[PDB]
């Protein structure tokens, strides 16, 4: 699978029928249809920069992985009674500034999106066990609006020159990804999925109402990452955002 016209989001249903499921992501958050839920606690992140491990070119994107052997790095609060363990973050972006986010708010497309991914370590003993369970994953989504250069993005963007081609990886250490999160953690939450194969309906989405900035040049650095292996013809990673999917009667809740 990929984001080509041949192996792309429109085609994914052929090998992953769950792509047409009832809890697919991302979605368009219509603010007129959200339900304020008084029972939602604030989101609490506490991440240890020593859990930062490795940055990997996975062909369609790049992932920053964290050591997840204990609860040094955790998400709590929001709609959760369980503590969720940080295991990675990544970005989605588009071919132009005009699109690039996965989630949209009242039809508005942002330029990119940050995903900070966590697994239910109160209930399950590994990511591999949790990854397919309804309550297994918690992912913070942060819409990224084109404007001023984001200096917190800096260590991440500086590391891409070492992982230019598919399968390259490099140490990436001493980093707290809570430094990328907006000042306000007022959020929307809905039950949904991974936004690429295998599209498991295992994610409680936490979508921040506040955006973060990214420059046109910072976005170009993402699109300059290559999906080919070293030695082959260079194929830029131009986009990796899935279209929004039908809510099919799910409710998006607002903490605010
Ligand atoms: O959240 C999404 Se999209 C996801 C993809 C790979 C690993 C973890 C989460
Ligand atoms: Zn993602």
* Centre of ligand 2 from the C-alpha of residue 127, in Å: 16
Contacts of residue 187, Cβ cutoff 8 Å, sequence gap at least 6: 40, 43, 78, 140, 206, 207, 208, 209, 254, 255, 256
Q: What's the CA-to-centroid distance between 92 and ligand 2, angstroms?
A: 6
**What was the elucidation method?**
X-ray
Instruction: Kindly name the residue from 36, 60, 103, 118 that is annotated as catalytic.
Output: 60
Q: Which ligand is nearest to the CA of 131?
A: 1
| CA–CA dist 129, 24 (Å, integer) | 20
| 162: region left, alpha or beta (phi > 0 left; psi from -120 to 50 alpha) | alpha
The tokens for 240 are 């990796």
CA atoms within 13 A on the CB side of 80: 31
Q: Which atom of ligand 1 is nearest to the CA of 131?
A: 8
Query: Based on the structure, what is the number of domains in the chain?
Result: 1
Give the distance (Å) from ligand 1 centre to CA of residue 255: 23
Q: Residue 191 is part of which domain span?
A: 1-256
Residues with CB under 6 A from ligand 1: 88, 115, 117, 139, 194-196
The CATH number for 5's domain is 3.10.200.10
Q: What is the resolution of this structure in A?
A: 1.8
Establish whether 103 is a catalytic residue: no
Closest listed residue to residue 121, CA positions, set 73, 52, 89, 78: 73
For residue 87, the ligand 1 atom closest to its alpha carbon is 8
Q: Could you tell me whether strands 28-29 and 104-105 are parallel, antiparallel, or unpaired per DSSP bridges?
A: parallel
Return all residues near 90 (Cβ < 8 A) that are at least 6 apart. Answer: 61, 62, 63, 64, 115, 117
């Amino acid at each position: 699978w990929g984001y080509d016209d041949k192996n792309g989001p429109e085609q994914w249903s052929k090998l992953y029928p769950i792509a047409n499921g009832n809890n697919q992501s991302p979605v368009d958050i219509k603010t007129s249809e959200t339900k304020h839920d008084t029972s939602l606690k604030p989101i609490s992140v506490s991440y240890n920069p020593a859990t930062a491990k490795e940055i990997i070119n996975v062909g369609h994107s790049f992932h920053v992985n964290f050591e997840d052997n204990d609860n040094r790095s955790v998400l709590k609060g929001g709609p959760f009674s369980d503590s969720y363990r940080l295991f990675q973050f990544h970005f989605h972006w588009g071919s132009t500034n005009e699109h690039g986010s996965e989630h949209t708010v009242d039809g508005v497309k942002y330029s990119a999106e940050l995903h900070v991914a966590h697994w239910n370590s109160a209930k399950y003993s590994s990511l591999a066990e949790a990854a397919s369970k309804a309550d297994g994953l918690a992912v913070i989504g942060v819409l990224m609006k084109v404007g001023e250069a984001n200096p917190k993005l800096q260590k991440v963007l500086d590391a891409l020159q070492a992982i230019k081609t598919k399968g390259k990886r490099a140490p990436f250490t001493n980093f707290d990804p809570s430094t990328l999160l907006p000042s306000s953690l007022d959020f929307w939450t809905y039950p949904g999925s991974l936004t690429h194969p295998p599209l498991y309906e295992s994610v409680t989405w936490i979508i921040c109402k506040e955006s973060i900035s990214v420059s046109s040049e910072q976005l170009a650095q993402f699109r300059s990452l290559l999906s080919n292996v070293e030695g082959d013809n260079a194929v830029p990673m131009q986009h990796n955002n899935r279209p929004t999917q039908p809510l099919k009667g799910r409710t998006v809740r607002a903490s605010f």
